[PDB]
Design a binder for these strands. Structure first.
Lengths: 23, 80, 96, 97, 97, 108, 18, 48, 105, 94, 81, 95
DNA sequence: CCCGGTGCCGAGGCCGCTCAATTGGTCGTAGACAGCTCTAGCACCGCTTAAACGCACGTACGCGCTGTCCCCCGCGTTTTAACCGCCAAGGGGATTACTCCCTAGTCTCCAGGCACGTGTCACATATATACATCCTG
DNA sequence: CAGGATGTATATATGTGACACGTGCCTGGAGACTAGGGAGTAATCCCCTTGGCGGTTAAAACGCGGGGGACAGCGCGTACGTGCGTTTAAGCGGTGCTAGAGCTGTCTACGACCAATTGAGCGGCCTCGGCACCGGG
């Protein structure tokens, strides 16, 4: 969904993938 | 009564830890007690002023929230 | 075709002259004074409206205004303003 | 025996209490203080259980912010330790004084 | 397959003081500039313009951040100025003149 | 009809109770306003104005001036304890500040 | 019991904020 | 019984072969927290 | 038959927002699109905060937004921080941060 | 009992839309409801003030838009304005 | 316009500091003060232009500035009629 | 004169008057500069510009009054940049 | 700090009722838009000059270092009360009855808000000696 | 322990800006006088949420010891202040021009308003599973 522009969408997906990879 | 000493040295030290301090002076506790007492006195005065107009015998978290909003310290969690 | 704007300068000067017969006031001071009156009017009226909305009342009354003044004015100014308002509300309802 | 150097346990306490989310002030003493303060405003006023908790939450948040600003002011003076003058400057800049 | 052309003009004006100044010996004022050929706002795509002067000045590397980009200065001799125009997009190579 | 008496004169105030009531009733404040609210509001405003005017006139006489200027307002506000708290977050144009020089920056 | 006995507005102002 | 109530979790996390209860007249009330905690324990055999 | 929320494509209660606006003494006439716009803005802000708090709580091995992670999101987002600057979230805690001067070495 | 009311249902729906699997506790839900109420109050007050400034007796979508502009910081304002305008445009077409 | 922040010179900033009580001023304090004044004017004038555009007006009146300052918390008397 | 006497003189002089300390013509150009970034061909009233200048001067005076105490806190007489930075941070403008 | 086991009460989903949201229908009024205008904002140019810019010089303030003295910090043991459950009953809230206060409308009428000209009535700017008020000897 | 040498007051004056004061206008207000509405005050009364009893350990507190941090003294260096000279654009106010904020006049779609219908939301209840708690690595 549209929450905010580039600096938020991509950074947010990256933060989401962070712990997914760490697991 | 004079039960202001309920906010003791260990409690003030834990508050300082949470605030990020790693070393406290010897005269910080008596100053923090007075600052907290003034802040309380103000918030409780506003709460009691709301309660008197509300004609309620019990002070409410809603009155506390209104007092905090008046003082500018908006608080979330208690229905406001 | 006139665009007349209102103000409180006619009464701010009456009170000024009654509390100080010999002292005047400049136009800039009168403007700042009217601004102060407007600001405090807005503050007190908004506080009374907030009290009414909290008490679930659609009308603001003298009691809401009194509690709003008690909340707004600090310390030994609150008491003075409240005594003045109370005395005025009692001298007004006595048909004088 | 074994004792840590000054500055090792303070950092542990900081790292602990900065992540833990729980009221640090003692509940019953804070309640007694709230009752004392309300006694000087109106006699025989009752308080809801949630009102005291809200007051404690607000006071603890205010004190946490005050101590943050105090530590900032202390570090501004090249001092790792805080002192009442730091709280004074913090409040002065905040506009509370 | 997208090619965008932006016309610009870069230059310098100079005014002669009429006599050599006793303070620093300079004889001319000069303003070095980049401006657009069209009546358009360069700031929509230019992040900054850097002007590198001769090493006689206290700082040779000057910066400007709004169009019409220009610097006013004083001097007595002619020298080559390197103007480096940076674009908002960091992936685009800045232009050198 | 009988000689019309204004609400301001009836109460004993100078500020316009009619205009205060008009603002209160047409504003965001509430649906309808009681007769006692605007009287109280105008009385409070008049009291604040009288107080600040007394202080400004005192400052003016101290400075040897007959006309209250924004200097006499700023000085009055920042010298009074309670009016300062009331108008802490309010700036006054051409009012200036107080000569509050820190004791640490004085000749030694 | 409420003493009152006076005007509604004045009475409320005087007592409701003792 | 008191310590069993205090640490029912620790005891409940342990599988017991036999559960012996001396003077079982202390759990005669089914509405008792003691009775509830002792029933919520994992035991293969029970001896009152 | 059709709720104005679904009509506008929103999840928030456009009707409740209109009722609250017309009953809150905000104005004597609430526009047709004013409550729709307000509900849309509220839904946008709510979605932002909920997404941030969700992926802040899921970053800690949890699957349920809690006040701690709500506070973490509100204080890590520079926009939401400026928005709720003078607001305090109960049981939210503070951000982990130790000054370099206090830190050893 | 009374009928205290909240946006809990809609908050939960938006939570499901953003994170289909991440739930929310009761404390968090109450905090979100309080936040929504406070933002509503602020935006409505700013819109009423704008109406009083422009001498308009009505709060319109344009007033709400300007109130959101006067409150949200930058990108947040630009996104909330787009959301509101799109919502109103889609509403006007039905 | 451009680079008009430099229209706040060192004498002006030093007078502003004298009025605030500062006795001795550093070198970079002037740049810091220019940057802070610019950031403040940015927000104030953004609020003013937001109050103006919404009114479909081409002139930024004094009431718009007053409302912007009120929003920012800097209530200003003397320009409200 | 000794460094500091002519400075305390100016302190006492400017804490006595109320005139504007920033020059009009230079400050109006800065105001129009900052307004250009929001609206092209924007008109401003003289009263509006004067109110803006008054607000700016009051804000800067308050900022320097706080910076003076921030500097004195470090046993320093000269205000350094970290002083204004701490002032802003504790005020909440660049926290 | 991370990991596997148990456990429980608070989260989340279902039931059902009602009251708010919605559908349909009317009046009118604030507003959208075009017409006109006259103020004020904009641009420009020259005489005056006060303020700004640049540079020299040294004096005093930042700042770095060192040393003492102690005042907090970590750890052990000792004493107080915060905390977690029951039991009256005192209040916070539903339910009903009813009146003073305000709303709404329409005339009648005192009051203030300017357009204008006239007459007073501050204190800004100018001038000078008196007083500090220095600072180099 | 002075004295040129500045700077800062203190007092007096005057005439041009501005309060100050009529003179009539009127139109937006301010109040008086009937008629109608309505919500909250007041009195009960059922029902939860306080405030009040006795234990349990967990945290507050008291002490100790030495260690690292505050505060004072001192000195090196440099930069920030002050003065002088050169330079620049800021203040003034005089003229020209038109752009649009504002007043105004007309016609109209939108929303408050009122009545009837319907289902979205919310209190309530129960089943269940995400994370609180915990002891070994």
């Amino acid at each position: 969904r549209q929450s905010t522009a580039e600096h938020t969408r991509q950074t947010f997906l990256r933060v989401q993938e962070r712990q997914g990879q760490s697991r | 009564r004079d039960n202001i000493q309920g906010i003791t040295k260990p409690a003030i030290r834990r508050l300082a830890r949470r605030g990020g301090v790693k070393r406290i002076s010897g005269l910080i506790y008596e100053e923090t007690r007075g600052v907290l007492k003034v802040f309380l006195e103000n918030v409780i005065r506003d709460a009691v002023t709301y309660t008197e107009h509300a004609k309620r015998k019990t002070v409410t978290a809603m009155d506390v929230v209104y007092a905090l909003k008046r003082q500018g310290r908006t608080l979330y969690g208690f229905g406001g | 075709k006139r665009s007349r704007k209102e103000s409180y300068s006619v009464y701010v000067y009456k009170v000024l002259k009654q509390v100080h017969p010999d002292t005047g006031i400049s136009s800039k001071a009168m403007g700042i004074m009217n601004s102060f009156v407007n600001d405090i009017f807005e503050r007190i009226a908004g506080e009374a409206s907030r009290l009414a909305h909290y008490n679930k009342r659609s009308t603001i009354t003298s009691r809401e205004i009194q509690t709003a003044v008690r909340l707004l004015l600090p310390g030994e100014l609150a008491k003075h303003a409240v005594s003045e308002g109370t005395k005025a509300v009692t001298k007004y309802t006595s048909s004088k | 025996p074994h004792r840590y150097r000054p500055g090792t346990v303070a950092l542990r306490e900081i790292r602990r209490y900065q992540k833990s989310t729980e009221l640090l002030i003692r509940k019953l003493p804070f309640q007694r203080l709230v009752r004392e303060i309300a006694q000087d405003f109106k006699t025989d006023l009752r308080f809801q259980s949630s009102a005291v908790m809200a007051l404690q939450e607000a006071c603890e948040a205010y004190l946490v912010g005050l101590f943050e600003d105090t530590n900032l002011c202390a570090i501004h003076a090249k001092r790792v330790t805080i002192m009442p003058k730091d709280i004074q400057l913090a409040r002065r800049i905040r506009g509370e004084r | 397959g997208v090619t965008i052309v932006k016309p610009i003009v870069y230059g310098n004006v100079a005014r002669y003081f009429g006599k050599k100044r006793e303070e620093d010996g300079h004889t001319h004022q000069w303003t070095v500039y980049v401006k657009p050929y069209r009546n358009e706002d360069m700031s929509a795509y230019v992040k900054k313009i850097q002007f590198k002067l001769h090493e006689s000045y206290g700082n040779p590397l000057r910066v400007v951040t709004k169009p019409p980009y220009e610097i006013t200065e004083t001097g007595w001799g002619e020298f080559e100025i390197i103007i480096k125009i940076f674009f908002i997009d960091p992936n685009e190579r800045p232009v050198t003149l | 009809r009988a000689k019309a008496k204004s609400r301001s004169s009836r109460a004993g105030l100078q500020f316009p109770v009619g205009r205060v009531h008009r603002l209160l009733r047409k504003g965001n404040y509430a649906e309808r306003v009681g007769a006692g609210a605007p009287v109280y509001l105008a009385a409070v405003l008049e009291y604040l104005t009288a107080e600040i005017l007394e202080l400004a006139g005192n400052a003016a006489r101290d400075n040897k001036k007959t006309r209250i200027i924004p200097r006499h307002l700023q000085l009055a506000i920042r010298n009074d304890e309670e009016l300062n708290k009331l108008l802490g977050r309010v700036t006054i144009a051409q009012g200036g500040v107080l000569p509050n020089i820190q004791a640490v920056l004085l000749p030694k | 019991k409420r003493p009152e006995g006076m005007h509604r507005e004045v009475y409320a102002l005087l007592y409701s904020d003792k | 019984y008191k310590l069993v109530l205090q640490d029912h979790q620790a005891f409940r996390r342990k599988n017991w072969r036999y559960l012996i209860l001396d003077e079982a007249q202390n759990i005669k009330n089914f509405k008792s927290q003691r009775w509830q905690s002792l029933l919520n324990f994992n035991s293969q055999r029970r001896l009152l």
